[PDB]
Ligand binder design. Sequence first.
Ligand SMILES: CSC[C@H]1N[C@@H](c2c[nH]c3c2N=CNC3N)[C@H](O)[C@@H]1O
Ligand SMILES: CSC[C@H]1N[C@@H](c2c[nH]c3c2N=CNC3N)[C@H](O)[C@@H]1O
Lengths: 230, 230
Amino acid sequence: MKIGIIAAMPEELAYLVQHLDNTQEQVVLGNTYHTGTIASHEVVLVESGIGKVMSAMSVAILADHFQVDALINTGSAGAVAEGIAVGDVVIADKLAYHDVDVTAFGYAYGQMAQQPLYFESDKTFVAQIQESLSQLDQNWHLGLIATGDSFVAGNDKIEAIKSHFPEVLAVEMEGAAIAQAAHTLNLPVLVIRAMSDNANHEANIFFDEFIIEAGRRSAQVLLAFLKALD
Amino acid sequence: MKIGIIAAMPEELAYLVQHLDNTQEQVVLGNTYHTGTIASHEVVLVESGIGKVMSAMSVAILADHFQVDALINTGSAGAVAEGIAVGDVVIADKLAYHDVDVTAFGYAYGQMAQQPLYFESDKTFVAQIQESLSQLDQNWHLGLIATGDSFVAGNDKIEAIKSHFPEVLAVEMEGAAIAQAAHTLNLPVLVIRAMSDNANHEANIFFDEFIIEAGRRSAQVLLAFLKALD
Ligand SMILES: CSC[C@H]1N[C@@H](c2c[nH]c3c2N=CNC3N)[C@H](O)[C@@H]1O
Ligand SMILES: CSC[C@H]1N[C@@H](c2c[nH]c3c2N=CNC3N)[C@H](O)[C@@H]1O
């Protein structure tokens, strides 16, 4: 298959570009799309930019211009579940928006109009990625990642998000957006994020400090996954 | 020029489709795009779906697949500024997100990372549309429309939005998203919305009752504009 891989920032795509075989770069609508293969898998890498709109646009272009068959997001996120450490990797089995309120019409909190409440990562992708990781390794996690067009940096917002999604493991700004776009195109999706901060008052500082490492760790897990996907 | 016209719901695109000359429907990525002309202006009409992600995808496809030169959004919105009545039309000279918080990094509230706080409708488009309207008509307005991935239905949220953007006239769910996407593509944009409700506790009821009329009114203003734009 042909996999479209999206990262919000350059720090989150660098490692993958460095491991891209038969690399070629195409400029489309002012952005660079890296084509080639990874572990014999045809892929297209792109730095979308931050947020729902930018990531959604990248999905649309990957589908319309490159005819991708699947979508995978890699990058950083803020750790919110107790016990998750900076540097840990969270594989999203499900994604949802923590900043969406269309409840006046009867939708569940977080559920966008005309959309399901939860977007699910491809069951086959999730099954296989777990198989590539060790059960003895306690630094990777499988669970819910909540998305919003905000950088979470305070216990108050963390608590507010948890009141709606108590099982949330991490938070970011593109996960559910890419999953929503993928769902709209009937394309399988997977989201992988490494923790760059604790989404608290010190989040901006930790993010600045750990974005390079988080971007690399998330990408390393993706690379290991792709090599085992076959 | 070639103008891409986006409406979130069918009720907001119907009138335009009914007045599209040399109309033809095409299916791209599972959605219908209506090509044709409106007063010597080549156009592409599309019902994007609700929200930031859906509207952003539509902008991307309009640019990548149809090579549009400009973008115009039409539809319904909730009236928030005192005095604005249901049925009134608001032309957005500027757009901003009311639900974006990346302030931890120093951005102004509402400003998305890597983006300006305000997205501006094309100055030429704004100047010309005002010329097509009567100064004696008090039912059209020119000002700020704030966008968010939520349906505003309560004075509490209205007050919260006003605390950040006191001059906001109306609120909706795609304006700033379409403007952001257009800005990313360096394409001129214009947003026009007719009031379907008062964004208060009764907003869902008024929306249900007035979406057909609001969609029509907004489209009527756009049609008049296009017939005078030349
Ligand atoms: C500079 S905005 C933060 C970016 N990094 C991710 C992120 C890391 N840590 C957090 C993120 N997003 C929200 N809250 C957080 N605590 C998001 O998905 C954006 O692409
Ligand atoms: C069924 S979600 C509402 C849709 N109509 C517009 C709307 C009308 N009235 C309101 C809207 N959006 C937010 N708050 C409001 N009070 C938005 O842009 C969505 O496309």
